[PDB]
Amino acid sequence: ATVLLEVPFSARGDRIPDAVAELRTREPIRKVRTITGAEAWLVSSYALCTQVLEDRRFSMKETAAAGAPRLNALTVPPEVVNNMGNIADAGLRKAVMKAITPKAPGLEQFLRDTANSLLDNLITEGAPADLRNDFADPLATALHCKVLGIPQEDGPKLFRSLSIAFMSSADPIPAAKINWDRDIEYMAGILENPNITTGLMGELSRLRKDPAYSHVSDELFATIGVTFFGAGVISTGSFLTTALISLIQRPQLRNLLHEKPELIPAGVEELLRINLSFADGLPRLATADIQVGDVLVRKGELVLVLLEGANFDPEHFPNPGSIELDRPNPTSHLAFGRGQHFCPGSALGRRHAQIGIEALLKKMPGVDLAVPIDQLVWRTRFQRRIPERLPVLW
Ligand code: HEM
Ligand SMILES: Nc1n[nH]cc1-c1ccc(O)cc1
Numbered sequence: 539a540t541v542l543l544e545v546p547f548s549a550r551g552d553r554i555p556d557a558v559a560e561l562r563t564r565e566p567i568r569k570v571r572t573i574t575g576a577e578a579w580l581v582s583s584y585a586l587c588t589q590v591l592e593d594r595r596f597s598m599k600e601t602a603a604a605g606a607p608r609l610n611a612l613t614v615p616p617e618v619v620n621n622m623g624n625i626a627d628a629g630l631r632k633a634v635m636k637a638i639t640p641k642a643p644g645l646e647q648f649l650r651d652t653a654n655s656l657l658d659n660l661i662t663e664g665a666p667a668d669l670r671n672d673f674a675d676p677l678a679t680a681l682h683c684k685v686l687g688i689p690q691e692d693g694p695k696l697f698r699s700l701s702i703a704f705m706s707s708a709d710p711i712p713a714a715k716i717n718w719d720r721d722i723e724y725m726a727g728i729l730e731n732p733n734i735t736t737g738l739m740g741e742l743s744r745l746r747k748d749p750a751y752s753h754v755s756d757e758l759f760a761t762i763g764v765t766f767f768g769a770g771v772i773s774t775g776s777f778l779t780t781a782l783i784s785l786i787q788r789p790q791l792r793n794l795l796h797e798k799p800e801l802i803p804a805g806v807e808e809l810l811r812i813n814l815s816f817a818d819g820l821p822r823l824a825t826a827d828i829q830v831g832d833v834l835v836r837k838g839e840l841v842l843v844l845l846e847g848a849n850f851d852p853e854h855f856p857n858p859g860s861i862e863l864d865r866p867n868p869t870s871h872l873a874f875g876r877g878q879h880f881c882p883g884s885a886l887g888r889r890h891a892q893i894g895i896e897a898l899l900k901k902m903p904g905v906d907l908a909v910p911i912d913q914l915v916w917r918t919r920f921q922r923r924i925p926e927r928l929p930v931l932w
Contacts, residue, residue: 551780558847613711650893687739810871849873
């Protein structure tokens with residue numbers, strides 16, 4: 539025999555497997571086995587991905603229930619899976635959303651400054667440079683310290699939790715709990731620290747002492763700090779790293795963007811569309827029996843929404859693998875999800891990538907890989923696809 543098709547198919551974030559277009563054409567929803575042994579439905583067309591993400595009966599929260607078929611082990615307490623629902627129930631959604639927009643005074647200039655400094659330091663040191671460890675990740679870390687209102691010097695230690703926190707493991711991870719409890723203690727300290735008066739933590743700290751929020755738990759306040767730092771940093775650092783690969787490998791596009799930087803937002807949007815940063819489909823648990831294409835998904839089954847399945851669907855995005863700056867539906871991709879759980883940091887993520895790319899093209903217009911592309915080491919069993927190092931010269 540064969541065996542039931544296993545997911546994920548590949549940890550490489552520089553190319554989509556030809557298999558994905560085959561699945562999408564032949565079986566855009568089909569049964570697969572996850573790393574835990576569970577069965578799941580893998581959905582790989584734009585039409586069916588959108589259907590699942592816009593129907594709340596495919597629940598994010600219920601993926602955390604004891605006994606459910608699992609994509610991977612939880613790395614957070616089960617109540618934290620419903621992190622945005624908990625924020626909304628506490629009456630904090632508007633305030634959190636306001637704090638993480640890129641439009642706060644000085645934020646963009648801070649980003650440009652940070653990027654330019656990181657690049658000057660690479661240039662001083664001489665090629666080769668590692669653009670993930672010494673540019674994309676420290677730019678994301680600095681950004682999220684600023685947005686949180688926490689000291690920049692605390693960013694590296696918070697960051698180092700992330701190579702465990704965002705693992706995609708078959709089994710529970712003891713180091714994840716150790717790092718989680720310590721990071722929650724750090725954020726609780728921030729909330730009690732009178733010097734912290736700006737950003738998302740300064741705003742939470744004020745709301746904590748307002749009568750309108752007196753019955754919101756200290757644990758929820760700390761948890762917002764830890765979760766927004768971690769999701770934001772991993773997601774922006776990983777997206778920028780793999781977007782830089784896709785740009786480096788298209789000298790014609792690199793040169794057009796360098797020359798006409800007003801096209802950078804359109805090119806970022808295409809880079810988001812083609813991005814293979816999410817290593818796994820987005821999980822949902824069916825709360826009812828729901829027809830999805832030719833399959834009747836049954837109550838209690840796991841569904842996995844394959845982002846690249848949707849974003850490379852030629853029925854929605856003709857010539858899907860090409861970066862085309864003049865598409866008529868450019869923001870209609872699923873790179874930030876869709877529906878109830880649409881990314882709350884989408885603007886912030888776009889801006890981080892736009893600024894980092896602008897700054898890199900101006901400082902290193904001759905940027906190129908310093909190693910053959912096949913020599914990049916792809917991180918395995920993780921919730922993002924990322925090269926461990928990204929060696930470049932210029
Ligand atoms: C390019 C950067 C980013 C990408 C590609 C990205 C992508 C995503 C995707 C696909 C989802 C949907 C998950 C789902 O439906 O299961 C999501 C949710 C989430 N994002 Fe992002 N994200 C980015 C940046 C950020 C930033 C900057 C933050 C915070 C500062 C952030 C915080 C979150 C949180 C807290 C959620 C969960 C929302 C919910 O459960 O309602 N993201 N993101
Ligand atoms: N910050 C985190 N570390 N490990 C898991 C998370 C996390 C969990 C949920 C979430 O909405 C955002 C982030």
